[PDB]
Structure 1
Amino acid sequence: SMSVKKPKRDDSKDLALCSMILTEMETHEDAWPFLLPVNLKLVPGYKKVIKKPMDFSTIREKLSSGQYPNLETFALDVRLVFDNCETFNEDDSDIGRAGHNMRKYFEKKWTDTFK
């Protein structure tokens, strides 16, 4: 509250560490469905159904230009990528399985780096 603060958690390396995580997600072999924005002209149904499209390239641009206020807003966009994928893709598809694998990979790196 006013003039009463919990001790200051060191957040000065967060930008660098989120960049490293995002590099590791970019270079995973199952990243291919997520590298670029879904082409809304060429994929029927995507525009209407997926209210907030997100992809790794869009995250990389937001990260590089100071559009994440803190590490939690960064994790929300990564998870959005996987939540979108589960909304549109069957679990038993190459893209569906890719999304499950990537989410697992992300969540481990996140815990190991920050928790």
Structure 2
Amino acid sequence: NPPPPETSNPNRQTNQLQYLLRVVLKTLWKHQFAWPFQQPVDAVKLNLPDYYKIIKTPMDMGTIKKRLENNYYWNAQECIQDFNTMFTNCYIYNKPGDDIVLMAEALEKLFLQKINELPTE
């Protein structure tokens, strides 16, 4: 595998960012379908031939959770895009009828529901 993505930013929208960690991520983390997305993809263990040749911006909730905890993000938009990157990576690598895709979509729908609760900008 390549190394996992960075969790620290080498350099106030903090309400939404706090909520992204405490409610959004935690709610997805606890969902039944969370396991494939709780850590960087280990393409050997999970036997995902060519995953890192196809997916150039790998992303996972383990990474996003640490970025939230390290106060890594520029802004809440940047975090929201890591979530979307994770989902869309799954839609790019896998066939649209696969279990893994159905799992991502369900998490994505839940994510959109929780994003609707975000505190104001």
What TM-score do the two structures reach when normalised by structure 1?
Answer: 0.83
Q: What is the count of residue pairs matched by the alignment?
A: 106
Two-structure CA RMSD over aligned residues (Å): 1.7
Q: Which runs of 5+ in 2 are unaligned?
A: 1-11
Distance 1:14 1:108 in 2: 14
Q: Alpha-carbon deviation of 1:85? A: 0.3
Q: Alpha-carbon deviation of 1:112? A: 2.7
Identity %: 30
Indicate conservation of the 8 Å contact 2:16/2:118, yes or no: no
| Structure ranking higher on relative contact order (CA contacts 8 Å, 6+ apart) | 2
Give the greater-gyration-radius structure (CA).
Answer: 1
Question: 1:93: which partner in 2?
Answer: 98
Distance 2:60 2:92 in 1: 14
Distance 1:88 1:114 in 2: 33
Name which of 61, 65, 76 aligns with 1:60.
65
Distance 1:87 1:60 in 2: 23
Distance 1:100 1:11 in 2: 27
